[PDB]
Write a protein that holds these residues in place. Structure first.
Motif, PDB file in Angstrom:
ATOM      1  N   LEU A   1      87.601 -56.860  55.444  1.00 52.21           N
ATOM      2  CA  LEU A   1      86.478 -57.749  55.177  1.00 52.21           C
ATOM      3  C   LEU A   1      85.704 -57.361  53.924  1.00 52.21           C
ATOM      4  O   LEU A   1      84.900 -58.166  53.443  1.00 52.21           O
ATOM      5  CB  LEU A   1      85.534 -57.776  56.380  1.00 52.21           C
ATOM      6  CG  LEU A   1      86.102 -58.386  57.663  1.00 52.21           C
ATOM      7  CD1 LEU A   1      85.127 -58.222  58.816  1.00 52.21           C
ATOM      8  CD2 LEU A   1      86.444 -59.851  57.451  1.00 52.21           C
TER       9      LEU A   1
ATOM     10  N   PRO B   1      79.473 -67.913  60.006  1.00 59.01           N
ATOM     11  CA  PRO B   1      80.176 -67.158  61.051  1.00 59.01           C
ATOM     12  C   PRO B   1      81.598 -66.815  60.634  1.00 59.01           C
ATOM     13  O   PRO B   1      82.382 -67.687  60.255  1.00 59.01           O
ATOM     14  CB  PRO B   1      80.156 -68.113  62.249  1.00 59.01           C
ATOM     15  CG  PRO B   1      79.003 -69.025  61.987  1.00 59.01           C
ATOM     16  CD  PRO B   1      78.981 -69.210  60.500  1.00 59.01           C
TER      17      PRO B   1
ATOM     18  N   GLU C   1      96.861 -64.118  71.262  1.00 61.59           N
ATOM     19  CA  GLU C   1      95.626 -63.350  71.263  1.00 61.59           C
ATOM     20  C   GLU C   1      95.537 -62.517  72.536  1.00 61.59           C
ATOM     21  O   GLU C   1      96.042 -62.908  73.591  1.00 61.59           O
ATOM     22  CB  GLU C   1      94.415 -64.281  71.153  1.00 61.59           C
ATOM     23  CG  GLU C   1      93.074 -63.575  71.044  1.00 61.59           C
ATOM     24  CD  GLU C   1      91.917 -64.543  70.894  1.00 61.59           C
ATOM     25  OE1 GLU C   1      92.162 -65.767  70.900  1.00 61.59           O
ATOM     26  OE2 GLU C   1      90.764 -64.079  70.770  1.00 61.59           O
TER      27      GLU C   1
ATOM     28  N   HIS D   1      93.280 -60.046  75.412  1.00 60.14           N
ATOM     29  CA  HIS D   1      92.007 -60.011  76.119  1.00 60.14           C
ATOM     30  C   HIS D   1      91.111 -58.953  75.478  1.00 60.14           C
ATOM     31  O   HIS D   1      91.453 -58.331  74.468  1.00 60.14           O
ATOM     32  CB  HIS D   1      92.223 -59.735  77.605  1.00 60.14           C
ATOM     33  CG  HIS D   1      92.971 -60.813  78.326  1.00 60.14           C
ATOM     34  ND1 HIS D   1      92.393 -62.016  78.673  1.00 60.14           N
ATOM     35  CD2 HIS D   1      94.246 -60.863  78.779  1.00 60.14           C
ATOM     36  CE1 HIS D   1      93.283 -62.762  79.304  1.00 60.14           C
ATOM     37  NE2 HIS D   1      94.416 -62.087  79.379  1.00 60.14           N
ATOM     38  N   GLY D   2      89.944 -58.737  76.067  1.00 55.62           N
ATOM     39  CA  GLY D   2      89.065 -57.670  75.638  1.00 55.62           C
ATOM     40  C   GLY D   2      87.884 -58.165  74.828  1.00 55.62           C
ATOM     41  O   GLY D   2      87.554 -59.354  74.787  1.00 55.62           O
ATOM     42  N   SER D   3      87.239 -57.210  74.168  1.00 55.86           N
ATOM     43  CA  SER D   3      86.058 -57.479  73.365  1.00 55.86           C
ATOM     44  C   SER D   3      86.435 -57.703  71.905  1.00 55.86           C
ATOM     45  O   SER D   3      87.546 -57.395  71.467  1.00 55.86           O
ATOM     46  CB  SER D   3      85.060 -56.326  73.478  1.00 55.86           C
ATOM     47  OG  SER D   3      85.585 -55.142  72.904  1.00 55.86           O
TER      48      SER D   3
ATOM     49  N   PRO E   1      85.547 -60.310  68.124  1.00 54.14           N
ATOM     50  CA  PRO E   1      85.337 -61.700  67.708  1.00 54.14           C
ATOM     51  C   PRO E   1      86.487 -62.594  68.140  1.00 54.14           C
ATOM     52  O   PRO E   1      87.585 -62.129  68.455  1.00 54.14           O
ATOM     53  CB  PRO E   1      85.252 -61.601  66.181  1.00 54.14           C
ATOM     54  CG  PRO E   1      86.050 -60.385  65.848  1.00 54.14           C
ATOM     55  CD  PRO E   1      85.829 -59.423  66.983  1.00 54.14           C
ATOM     56  N   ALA E   2      86.218 -63.897  68.156  1.00 52.52           N
ATOM     57  CA  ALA E   2      87.224 -64.883  68.526  1.00 52.52           C
ATOM     58  C   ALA E   2      88.295 -64.948  67.444  1.00 52.52           C
ATOM     59  O   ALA E   2      88.058 -65.491  66.360  1.00 52.52           O
ATOM     60  CB  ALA E   2      86.579 -66.252  68.732  1.00 52.52           C
ATOM     61  N   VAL E   3      89.472 -64.410  67.740  1.00 49.95           N
ATOM     62  CA  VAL E   3      90.555 -64.336  66.765  1.00 49.95           C
ATOM     63  C   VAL E   3      91.432 -65.578  66.886  1.00 49.95           C
ATOM     64  O   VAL E   3      91.868 -65.920  67.995  1.00 49.95           O
ATOM     65  CB  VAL E   3      91.383 -63.054  66.953  1.00 49.95           C
ATOM     66  CG1 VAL E   3      92.571 -63.045  66.007  1.00 49.95           C
ATOM     67  CG2 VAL E   3      90.513 -61.827  66.736  1.00 49.95           C
TER      68      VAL E   3
END
Ligand SMILES: [Ca+2]
Ligand SMILES: [Ca+2]
Ligand SMILES: [Zn+2]
Lengths: 340, 522, 222, 342
Positions: free
Chosen positions: C52, C63, C121, C123-125, C127-129
């Motif tokens: 990033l 966002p 994709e 599971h887990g924590s 950002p929405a990938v």
DNA sequence: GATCTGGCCTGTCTTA
């Protein structure tokens, strides 16, 4: 204070957080679409239309002597009175901060077919650093209109901008500029009261005094609870400015300001904290040298809003707020809000 | 590389391994059945017999578009028993038994069959085979010997749901719903099974000839295949349970008292009545008499419950109940599709922001296990404006968590006896809750697995001993291995991949090698 | 299992391999550009960094919901040159040159990029990938020295389309049509490329400093 | 001599190779679907009706005293004169063979609705083993009827049948069996002119004679061009059976027999060699005691049949033939063409 | 000549 759903058409993808709903004689117009303009509309300016709680988007063209501007994502929009708007700053789809002023103006209309005139205007003298998340307002003082601009945020300067932090953004220097729309001269002023920079604030304009309210400071990472005021004068010579703090501030980040009645501005929630979402709305009523704030009766919010983390929107001009909620995987639920 | 660099042979070349493989593969050890097997050859050196079993492939005959490979059932059993020699010897030595004893050992085997999908077809020359693949495997479960007047458990699989103990038997490329090719391929296996179900095996391991007797059990079958092979209609009918013969309404009314009267010969009698029609009845009368039988059975299955699919169905139902609870259906019996869409999206977003989960199309397995927590009930109640619904869902989930360990443990009578002893009361309270405070959904209808859980769990536990050690999840775990082997450990040819995958998956499930890999634990 | 059965350490434990890995990965060998790189730091120990590039993730601004990891271009090329030193020396020996030569080498490269669909994709924590993927890689083609009055090649790729010479540079999980995110991720790499298109590299090969200059060519684009 | 495209409804999967169309007073009825009967039709028998070159299936029910029969994939259809048919042999959906014999009929008719009476018939005496791919006819001799059965394939005997060759098939004995429908009894007759087992042949009947054409022999893998003339006679005592070979044979297996008019049949389809599918037709003529097989016009085949590999079908009764070809699969599993000849 | 019946369809639920 009444929510209502909106059924959008097919081109929902062309809406993105950071658009701008410009208004021209009740005809609300769209700007700032996602990505570069396709061949369906080489201009990227759409004609907003809400009927029976349904939304439609149709293209629009420019004049024979206009300038095709790139779709921005965080410009500074302000009205002007020959009714026209001013566009400054913004963030192009290539993350290139533009530093050029564009002017929108309707030049022809015939049975719901309009034709704009997007002129090009640069600046001289103390030109502002290209930035976004700022505001600009016009000021009438002694039979003369002058534009007041406040600082925002921008990337690192051309020296310390390293590749490992190529996208880092800090708050710009808190200066105050005066832009002459007729000539294009921008003069830099310094105010002792403005201690630190500010971005995503709310600028309320009036006869001769601009009202700054709320915002977000990236340096200290604090959302202040102050409100400012900037009165100016336009004598036969060099101008003069002023700035004094005021009691009874409001802590809001990225609000949406609209006008309900003459000298009666209502404001909706923004961002209260980082992970906390503002919900209650305020009401700004002015006198001659006074202000007024009051927690209104909050509308009946829906369950999806009470848990959404991100939300955006802008003003429609006719005392109506157009906001959206991100979906999943169609992609953005759109609601409308009417005031009085 | 190692040989060229180190200048010596730490490892052996390929031909040595190839020659060593011929010992573990079937068709290498001698054996004989004291009662001769009817319609089964006594030769004892057959390897990978063709799956088509000599089916006529002429142009006039019914067309054939499937390929299959498999072993001889009895040879496979002999090889599996010879693979576990050391384990049986150590079990006899540890249980205070002389190793030279040759008593009539008893062996129990669990069978399983599933139909895979999305298997890509290959190019080249050959028959136009479909994409759906089907396999069939077995697993040696437990062995006992009759010493004196007891039955000493000389060996039990410590992980009855692991892919390391699910040994393959047959492979094919055909649809599971294609009833013609399925039976045409599975007829010889059922024939050999029914033949050897009335004999006894003898063979000499450790220098002593032994004696074996088999008691097979078929439980690794999902509900659909059970309906198919046993001669029943689809699942959406009115005769829901495969253990009791109650209807939809009577299963939505009682929910408590249901015994089991459904054997394998009973299905044959039902089909014979349905075919001959001795009472010259009408369609509905004869259907009520036969309790919904319109197909001749061809596989003797055990009337048990698949734990994995039961958990999946319960999770899906609960998820639907959460959806309905969020939308306040009991207050507004009318709702549009768009309202359903928005309710589901809100629930998905909340579960994503509060439970670290993502939206999925079909109900998963891990999503099921992770969705069934008290914190999930809390997160769901964070959206319901009412407060009595909260306590209702709390009691619902508490009863379900109180009933869960009964049909999921390898031995409930020795791990959670309190749940087993208190299962009937909990099930009755669960049914009463559903009937009273869930009328908006369960008024006159009930699915399969709720009936299975609330009707026949105690009887199956007290009869067969345990549920969970007999599920079909081992075959599903082996499906992964089948995919990986077919993709990376076989000849990329249309008429050579089946035998290679079968041989490799047979070699992978040999405990003889599993002992060499556990040397560090010595 | 080998150590348990045989009783002799034919292979080393995992930690030895993990320690040996730090020699081949970029950001290990020292170097120095002739004309200091513009807008580029001088740290020669820069390994895997966030893709990033310091993009803000606050709830206020635009966002972003994509994760990325990448090396630094110049360190990547330094590691690539360290990887193929033996081949360059053998090419110099074959064409009847001297190993102690340090003339200005010319390295042409081939960039490539493509979008990958059907990337599930987890599971887990986080950002929405999105359910996509985009890669970015490069490959050296031919090294050329200026000897006498003309040019001659030293090491050309025998298998140009082989996977064994496709060095990965940048990796991210985003749509190939998301122009905003795509540019926000790829702008630092393009800035580095533009800065490196007018510089020269000093690098030590076999104990002798060498000179490098590059010619960039991007063709692996559909 | 026309070839017509046919559009099929939704349950096109319910048609499989080996079906048997049955006719009842201008109404064609489908039989022998794929798999066990579902809940859309608990019986299996469907109404065959073609309207504007479009195909639609319609279920049907049975009477109270009927016997629900399982689907069969290679039965032995045979007309009879109220009006009724005979079904014998075939392969159950469980790949098993059925030795039972069936007698279909009409029970009632009201507004295009037909009710059947499927009655199982007991066979005693020299019962044949369960067969398939054979034929059966009925002869009339001095006001008496008698069924003639010949041919058919079957599995290995109970002893020699092993699970390594469980699906191996063998041609049955060339014995000829006379089946009596009144007593439900049969009798085994052996003939000297019959040496090779035959299957998938074509049986053409007459007043008291039946004719054999083509077929296949597993014992030799040859398609002989034979023509047998069986003249069954029913005196006041034991019946009499005689055979006679005749010239002018056809080498075809699994052909389609249709009736344009009396004393003249039309044969089309089948196979000449393993991969050389038969394309030319054949015209026969039934005189008093003679037969004349001759060639006719070759209908214009489309580009699909000329480069296909397999086909199937049966007779419809009104000089029309129902013909199908294998389609794609991913799409429609089969295509179907009707043929007109009158 | 409206008046139920029959079959045709059609959305929903049940296993995967
Ligand atoms: Ca499956
Ligand atoms: Ca691609
Ligand atoms: Zn039941």
């Amino acid at each position: 204070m009444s929510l209502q759903m909106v059924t959008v058409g097919h081109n929902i993808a062309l809406i993105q957080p950071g658009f701008s709903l410009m208004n021209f004689d009740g005809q609300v117009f769209f700007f700032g679409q996602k990505g570069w303009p396709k061949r369906s509309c080489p201009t990227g300016v759409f004609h907003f239309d809400i009927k029976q709680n349904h939304l439609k988007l149709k293209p629009a063209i420019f004049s024979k002597d206009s300038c095709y501007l790139p779709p921005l994502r965080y410009p500074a929009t302000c009205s002007y009175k020959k009714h026209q708007y001013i566009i400054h700053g913004g963030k192009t789809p290539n993350n290139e901060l533009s530093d050029k002023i564009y002017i929108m103006s309707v030049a022809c209309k015939n049975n719901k077919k309009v034709t704009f005139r997007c002129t090009e205007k640069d600046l001289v003298g103390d030109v502002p650093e290209p930035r976004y998340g700022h505001s600009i307002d016009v000021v009438y003082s002694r039979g003369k209109s002058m534009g007041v601009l406040f600082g925002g945020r921008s990337y690192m300067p051309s020296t310390q901008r390293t590749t490992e932090k190529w996208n880092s953004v800090a708050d710009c220097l808190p200066h105050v500029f005066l832009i002459d729309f007729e000539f294009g001269c921008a003069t830099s002023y310094i105010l002792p009261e403005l201690q630190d920079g500010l971005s995503f604030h709310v600028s309320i304009a009036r006869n001769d005094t601009v009202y700054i309210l709320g915002g977000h400071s990236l340096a200290s990472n604090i959302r202040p609870a102050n409100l400012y005021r900037i009165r100016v004068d336009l004598p036969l010579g060099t101008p003069a400015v002023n700035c004094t703090v005021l009691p009874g501030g409001i802590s809001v980040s990225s609000a949406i300001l609209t006008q309900t009645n003459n000298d009666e501005f209502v404001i909706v929630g923004g961002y209260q904290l980082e992970n906390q979402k503002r919900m209650v709305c305020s009401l700004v009523s002015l006198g001659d040298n006074t202000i007024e704030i009051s927690e209104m009766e909050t509308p009946d919010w829906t369950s999806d809003i009470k848990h959404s983390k991100i939300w955006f929107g802008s003003n429609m001009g006719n005392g109506t707020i157009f906001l959206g909620i991100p979906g999943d995987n169609e992609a953005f639920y759109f609601y409308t809000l009417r005031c009085s | 590389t190692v040989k060229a660099i180190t200048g010596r042979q730490i490892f052996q070349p390929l031909h040595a391994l190839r020659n060593a493989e011929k010992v573990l593969l079937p068709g290498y050890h001698p054996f004989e059945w004291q009662p001769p097997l009817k319609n089964v050859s006594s030769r004892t050196d057959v390897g990978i017999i063709d799956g088509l079993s000599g089916l006529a492939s002429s142009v006039d005959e019914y067309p054939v578009d499937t390929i299959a490979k498999r072993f001889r059932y009895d040879s496979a059993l002999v090889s599996a028993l010879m693979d576990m020699e050391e384990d049986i010897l150590e079990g006899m030595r540890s249980q205070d038994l002389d190793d030279y004893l040759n008593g009539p050992f008893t062996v129990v085997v669990k069978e399983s069959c599933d139909g895979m999908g999305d298997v890509s077809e290959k190019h080249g020359s050959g028959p136009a085979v479909p994409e759906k693949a089907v396999r069939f495997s077995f697993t040696v479960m437990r062995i006992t010997i009759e010493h004196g007047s007891q039955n000493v458990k000389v060996f039990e699989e410590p992980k009855p749901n692991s892919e390391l103990c699910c040994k393959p038997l047959c492979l094919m490329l055909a649809d599971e719903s294609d009833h013609e090719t399925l039976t045409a391929i599975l007829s010889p296996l059922i024939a050999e099974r029914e033949a050897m179900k009335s004999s006894e095996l003898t063979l000499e391991m450790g220098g002593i000839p032994r004696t074996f007797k088999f008691i097979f059990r078929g439980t690794g079958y999902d509900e659909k295949l059970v309906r198919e092979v046993e001669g029943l209609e689809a699942s959406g009918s009115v005769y829901i349970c495969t253990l009791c013969d109650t209807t939809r309404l009577e299963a939505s009314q009682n929910l408590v008292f249901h015994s089991i009267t459904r054997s394998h010969a009973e299905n044959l009698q039902r089909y014979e009545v349905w075919r001959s029609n001795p009472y010259h009845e009408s369609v509905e009368e004869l259907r009520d008499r036969v309790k919904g039988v319109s197909a001749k059975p061809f596989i003797e299955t055990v009337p048990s419950i698949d734990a994995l699919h039961c958990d999946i169905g319960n999770a899906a139902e609960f998820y639907k109940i959460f959806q309905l609870e969020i939308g306040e259906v009991y207050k507004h019996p009318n709702a549009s599709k768009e309202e359903r869409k928005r309710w589901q999206a809100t629930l998905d977003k909340h579960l994503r922001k509060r439970m670290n989960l993502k939206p999925i199309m079909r109900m998963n397995g891990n999503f099921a296990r992770k969705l069934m927590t008290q914190e999930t009930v809390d997160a769901v109640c964070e959206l319901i404006p009412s407060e009595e619904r909260h306590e209702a869902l709390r009691e619902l989930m508490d009863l379900y968590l109180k009933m869960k360990p009964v049909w999921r443990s390898s031995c409930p009578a020795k791990e959670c006896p309190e749940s087993l002893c208190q299962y009937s009361f909990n099930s009755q309270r669960f049914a009463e809750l559903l009937s009273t405070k869930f009328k908006y959904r369960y008024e006159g209808k009930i699915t399969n697995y709720f009936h299975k859980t609330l009707a026949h769990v105690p009887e199956i536990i007290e009869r067969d001993g345990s549920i969970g050690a007999w599920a079909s999840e081992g075959n599903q775990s082996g499906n992964k291995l089948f995919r990986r082997f077919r993709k990376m450990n076989a000849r990329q040819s249309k008429c050579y991949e089946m035998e290679d995958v079968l041989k490799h998956h047979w070699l992978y499930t040999s405990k003889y090698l599993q002992k060499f890999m556990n040397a560090h634990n010595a």
